[PDB]
Amino acid sequence: DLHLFDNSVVFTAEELSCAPAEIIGRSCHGTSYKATLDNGYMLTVKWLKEGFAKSKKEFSREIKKLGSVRHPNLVPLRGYYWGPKEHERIMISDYADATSLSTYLSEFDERNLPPLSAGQRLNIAIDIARCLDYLHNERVIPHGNIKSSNVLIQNSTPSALVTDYSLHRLMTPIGMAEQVLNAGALGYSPPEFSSTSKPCPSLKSDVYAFGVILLELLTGKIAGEIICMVDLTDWVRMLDLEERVSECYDRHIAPQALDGMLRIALRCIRSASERPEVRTVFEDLLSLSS
């Protein structure tokens, strides 16, 4: 059983299974593969861990809502595969020849790549806020899985792409708990998640996680790395109170835009009640490009 949302990208279930496939990576959700169709079309084949996918009726209903979600800065979801076995729960999207933000930030020196300039960092940030603006305001659906590994950097336009959106919409409580736990471990969970036994990703949690991304863009540090002081967000928050915010900036980059980005990032990581709406954040990041 293979379902395609549009007639734009068409293939068989037997064509997908007999396609040259290579592992992209593994996560809390499951594993990602790159599949190359006969005509050159490249797809992302994301297998959800067994027990993570909701029952067929709910999953189909929820994923069709996600299938209609389209934005230039969001990677298109083309379909899904539902097989006779319990492990055969696959989400199918476009494949982008890119490098993720976390891979760029951590392994840029090892690779040929030059560090991201101050302008590129502002640009990535605007492309992400643009996408969340649309999700939050027009579709009223949270991403809920924001992390630097879900931000893709490509040479072609648009420079930044957001992937793996709204997965909590398709999962059992088991699936959702594993996602929240992993986001907590990586540092993307807001302070209100501590007060709940079973917290759910939301429009509010997205703005928090977006704040952590802005901090990774500004410092050049991955969110889950411990710092001698300890938390990335705590580091910046502790440095700010001690009048030492400038010291957080990546040594590979100070343009006023970085300070603008910092004031926005700090607003994003405040309590739910003081946390700005995503349109305000998008507009404020956008004013920095002028």
Q: Which residue has the tokens 């590994």?
A: 149
Out of 11, 19, 29, 146, point to the residue binding ligand ANP (CB under 6 A).
Answer: 29
Whose Cβ is closer to ligand ANP: residue 32's or residue 219's? 32
Which residues in the 245-284 window bind Mg ion by CB under 5 A? none
Contact range with Mg ion by CB under 5 A, out of 57-65, 149-157, 203-211, 257-265: 149-157
**Inter-CA distances, 207 with 15, 31, 189, 212, 275, Å:** 40, 26, 10, 9, 7
95 vs 134 by CB, closer to ligand ANP: 95
Residue 99: closest CA among 44, 157, 159, 55: 159
Nearer to Mg ion, 146 or 215 (CB): 146
What phi, psi does 43 have (nearest 5°)? -120, 155
Binding mask 147-186 for ligand ANP (x = CB under 6 A): --xx-x-----------x----------------------
Q: Is 164 annotated as a binding residue?
A: yes
Q: Which residue has the tokens 């036994």?
A: 197
Give residue for tokens 């490009």.
289
Look at residue 63 and give its three-state secondary structure. helix
Total residues interacting with Mg ion, rule: CB under 5 A: 3
> In terms of Cα–Cα distance, which of 88, 95, 119, 116 is closest to 23?
95
Q: Which residue is nearest to Mg ion (CB)?
A: 164
Question: In whole angstroms, how close is the CB of 155 to ligand ANP at the nearest point?
Answer: 12
Q: Please give the Cα distance from 74 to 227 (Å, whole number).
A: 32
Q: For residues 93 and 219, which CB has a smaller minimum distance to ligand ANP in the complex?
A: 93
How many Å from the N-terminal Cα to the C-terminal Cα in the chain? 50
**Residue list for the binding site for Mg(2+):** 150, 164
Which residues of this chain interact with Mg ion, rule CB under 5 A? 150, 163-164
The binding site for ligand ANP (CB under 6 A) comprises 24-25, 27, 29, 32, 95-96, 98-100, 102-103, 145, 149-150, 152, 164
